[PDB]
Design a protein around this ligand. Sequence first.
Ligand code: ECH
Length: 307
Amino acid sequence: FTIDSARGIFPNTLAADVVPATIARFSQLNAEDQLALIWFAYLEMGKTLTIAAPGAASMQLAENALKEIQAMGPLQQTQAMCDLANRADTPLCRTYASWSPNIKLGFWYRLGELMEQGFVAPIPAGYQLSANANAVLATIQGLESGQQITVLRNAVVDMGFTGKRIAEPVVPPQDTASRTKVSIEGVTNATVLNWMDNLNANDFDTLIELFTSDGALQPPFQRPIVGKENVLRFFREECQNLKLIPERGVTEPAEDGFTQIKVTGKVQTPWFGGNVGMNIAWRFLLNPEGKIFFVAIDLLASPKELL
Ligand SMILES: CC1=C(/C=C/C(C)=C/C=C/C(C)=C/C=C/C=C(C)/C=C/C=C(C)/C=C/C2=C(C)C(=O)CCC2(C)C)C(C)(C)CCC1
């Protein structure tokens, strides 16, 4: 096996590829249409989904950029937002690109509050979406909540212009005594259980020791992240305060004393908590010693993809 060939394990797993499909359609749109479409999606979603407040540390890291935009005239505020959507090369776009996803999301969270209040230039009153934009919004509004929030996150992350990396502080791992242990029907594999339990405890230093030196983690609709340095950085930047709720799985032999394990269940992001349960598969390829050579995390097409 190579990392790129391991991508093919459990090929019956039907991923929600409508998500990258919809992001590709979104990316073609006029910048003003991109901003208006997300405004409309965000307003409707907020009627039933409450977004968690951005962390204090995140907001502090975004404060100077938010103040710069708040100080602009309305025309310049709209232009700054269009620059981000267009991935234009500007100082603000380079600052934005240096940020972790959570800082980018917190930035837009605060601009959305200020736009609702009228302190930052809002989407024009009675703005009508382009033909392509109206259809992209219709697609988004027809998706399950877990797919909707993934489209919005991916759209936000893709903005700005690419390097110095700015991320939230890493909260210390959960005290041992208060930690939960997951149970998975059909899976007792210590590596898989330790994966779930250490991620639920934000214990990234214990988690990274489960990998081979050349091992990779593949997040939903992303290329594999390869090697302990890159995987640990990903954990520390993006993987704080998740709740993994694995349900059931299957354990099979693979080539050369390797083991392949597929688990299905749900994950909660701290942005939505129990309000959005994303249907997830984990696909593990373990070496004979039980180290992770490859683990993929897939957003599933529907609840019918759960085992
Ligand atoms: C832009 C914009 C606006 C504001 C937009 C805002 C404010 C959007 C906010 C969106 C948010 C807050 C979305 C959050 C989504 C989070 C997700 C989808 C998280 C998923 C996590 C997963 C699936 C993790 C799974 C993993 C597992 C289980 C592992 O085992 C290993 C690690 C890992 C792979 C990470 C306004 C309105 C102003 C209009 C103008 C433009």
